[PDB]
Amino acid sequence: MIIGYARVSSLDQNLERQLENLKTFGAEKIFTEKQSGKSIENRPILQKALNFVEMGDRFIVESIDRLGRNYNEVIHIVNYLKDKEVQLMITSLPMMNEVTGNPLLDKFMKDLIIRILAMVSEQE
Amino acid sequence: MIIGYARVSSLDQNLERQLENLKTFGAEKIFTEKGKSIENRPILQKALNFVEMGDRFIVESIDRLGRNYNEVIHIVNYLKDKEVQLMITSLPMMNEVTGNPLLDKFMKDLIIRILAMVSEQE
Amino acid sequence: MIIGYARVSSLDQNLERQLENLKTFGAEKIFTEKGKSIENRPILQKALNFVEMGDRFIVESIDRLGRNYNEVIHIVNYLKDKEVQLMITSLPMMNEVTGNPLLDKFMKDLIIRILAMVSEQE
Amino acid sequence: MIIGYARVSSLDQNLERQLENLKTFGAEKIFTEKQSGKSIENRPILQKALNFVEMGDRFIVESIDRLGRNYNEVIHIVNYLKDKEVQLMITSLPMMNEVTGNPLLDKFMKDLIIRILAMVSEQE
């Protein structure tokens, strides 16, 4: 199935938009959490979302920065979903998971994209 | 329209495939030439003067277009200024990898520049 | 010689640090200005006309130089054509990351272009 | 200590140069192997080198392509040495492991560099 994860530091942030995007992109359930993306230890809801998703499911977020603002922890999460065979989609990067007969590059794209964004998120 | 470009420095290369891959994606014309520089490649210059706004310049791979990081970037810049959409047959969909127009441009620049440094050091 | 550049669009920013970080690395002069475009930034233009071959144009970060992917790349191109070594105080050693002159150039282009797309979308 | 690994498909390749570079860069022992970099399963010498190196040691190669021509297997090896706390150096990229007060980027550099090169090696 399709699980989404939404995070905002404050309520003044457009949380409705985020939830609508996740829904629009097929979110069945959305684990919503009001917390900073600096660390995962203080984000039990994320731990629930990651534990709930299972082989075959889809885990969606609007952006990497929503998943976290910690390069190390973010990359750790991206590999967790791979190993668990859960597909990570980013609604702002809808075609990132699309196939183009070059498994090498495609995989290499994600690795680059995700690592760039995971860093950016942390530096900000 | 759609325009292609092919190159083979020597006498022993599968030039037929190169011409057939361009035709596959819809190459209407092909400026075939027989990549260390552009000064000694007029067939390329002709292919660049032909293409105008709205057209699509295509190669099989960036190494065909040239084996010089400096020159290969200068030409991709040329095609852009001229509003000619560059496409690689071996790397289709390079335009929109994610959907975000911001990263699409960035990656396009990135992959091209990877391919260019490879084309040179080889 | 060594030349710096600083910018602050508004009235509430730690402009002192920005001027002190440039001085730290050896900024002899600083063209301070008060980044959505360059047409409305002459102090930058003056900093670019001053720098000549052999000089070193420095900023604190690429976002200072401008918040436009298109324009930020055009200026780094300008500095290169003019043989002016661009350096970022917050990212020193960006020049030689590995030692291989081939990757150094590639990465330089890469990090800059990452920083540029960030400076814009922010 | 400093262990090096040298590989060549054929003897017509300048193996002496490779060995001299490894030595010059401090190679104490050099596991030399005459084999393709397409796979590791058919490279028992590499398996010996990787098993021999231990926490604190250094594992050096002239280039990534020497380590392999398989993006997946290469990345698998780079993480193996990390987890084992063995420092991977590339004599053609001597300053790649150098420190520059930006642990974020530095790590992000390697991830990019290594992933670029690992791909290039495979595609060639």
Domains of chain B: 2-122 (3.40.50.1390)
Nearest to A84, CA basis, from A114, A59, A118: A59
d(CA B53, CA B84): 5
Chain C: give the shortest CA distance to residue B80, in Å: 12
> Mutate which of D95, D97, D114, D116 to disrupt the C interface (most C C-beta within 10 Å)?
D95
Nearest to B84, CA basis, from B55, B122, B119, B44: B55
d(CA C22, CA C30): 8
For helices A103-123 and C101-121, angle between their N-to-C axes, nearest 10 degrees: 60
Report CA D83 to chain centroid distance, whole Å.
15
β-strand partners of B56? B2
The residue of chain D with its CA nearest to that of B113 is: D116
Instruction: Name the pairing type of β-strands B2-7 and A87-90.
Output: unpaired
d(CA C27, CA C16): 14
Q: Does B96 touch chain A (CB under 8 A)?
A: yes
CB under 8 Å to B11, separation ≥6 — which residues?
none
Q: Does D36 touch chain C (CB under 8 A)?
A: no
Q: What is the 3-state secondary structure (H, E, C) of C66-77?
A: CCCHHHHHHHHH
A21 residue type, one letter:
N
DSSP state of A90: E
The residue of chain B with its CA nearest to that of C101 is: B117
Q: Virtual CA dihedral for B110, B113, B117, B120, nearest 10 degrees?
A: 150
Q: Does C109 touch chain B (CB under 8 A)?
A: yes
d(CA D23, CA C112): 36
Helix (H) or strand (E) holding B83: none
Q: What is the 3-state secondary structure (H, E, C) of C1-32?
A: CEEEEEECCCCCCCHHHHHHHHHHHCCCEEEE
What is the phi/psi pair of residue D120, to 5°?
-40, -50
Q: Virtual CA dihedral for C95, C96, C98, C102, nearest 10 degrees?
A: 70
Instruction: Name the pairing type of β-strands C29-33 and B87-88.
Output: unpaired
CB B43 within 8 Å of CB B31: yes
Residues of C in contact with A92 (CB under 8 A): none
Q: Does D104 touch chain A (CB under 8 A)?
A: yes
Q: Contact D115/A122, CB-based, under 8 Å?
A: no
- Resolution of the deposited coordinates, in angstroms? 2.4
The residue of chain C with its CA nearest to that of D106 is: C97
d(CA D23, CA D16): 10
Q: Please state, as a whole number, how many other Cβ atoms lie within 10 Å of the Cβ of residue B37.
A: 10
CB B114 within 8 Å of CB B73: no
Q: Does D94 touch chain C (CB under 8 A)?
A: yes
Q: What is the 3-state secondary structure (H, E, C) of D10-48?
A: CCCCCHHHHHHHHHHCCCCEEEEEECCCCCCCCCHHHHH
Residues of C in contact with B78 (CB under 8 A): none
CB D122 within 8 Å of CB D115: no
d(CA A107, CA A88): 13
Q: Is D63 a catalytic residue?
A: no
Distances (CA, A) of B120 to B37, B58, B66: 11, 20, 8
CB B4 within 8 Å of CB B32: no
What is the phi/psi pair of residue C96, to 5°?
-110, 90
Distances (CA, A) of B39 to B35, B36, C65: 10, 9, 35
d(CA B20, CA B33): 15
Helices (H) and strands (E) in chain C, counts: 5, 4
d(CA A116, CA C116): 13
d(CA A52, CA A14): 26
What is the phi/psi pair of residue D99, to 5°?
-100, 140
Chain B: give the shortest CA distance to residue D65, in Å: 13
β-strand partners of C3? C29, C57
Q: Contact B106/C121, CB-based, under 8 Å?
A: no
What is the phi/psi pair of residue C41, to 5°?
-140, 85
CB C69 within 8 Å of CB B105: yes
d(CA A8, CA B86): 40
The residue of chain A with its CA nearest to that of C114 is: A116
Q: Which residue has the tokens 């690592």?
A: A115
Q: Contact C97/D109, CB-based, under 8 Å?
A: yes
CB under 8 Å to A45, separation ≥6 — which residues?
A5, A31, A32, A33, A35
Helix (H) or strand (E) holding D66: helix D64-67
CB C5 within 8 Å of CB C46: no
Q: Percentages helix, strand, coil for chain B, rounded to the nearest 5?
A: 50, 15, 40
Catalytic residue among D9, D10, D36, D121: D9
Establish how many alpha carbons lie within 13 A of residue A100's alpha carbon, considering only the half-sphere containing its beta carbon: 22
With 0-12 CB in 10 A as exposed, 13-18 as middle and 19+ as buried, what is C68?
middle
d(CA B28, CA D46): 50
Q: Which residue has the tokens 């690992």?
A: D118
Q: Contact B107/A98, CB-based, under 8 Å?
A: no
What is the phi/psi pair of residue D5, to 5°?
-135, 120
Q: Does B39 touch chain D (CB under 8 A)?
A: no
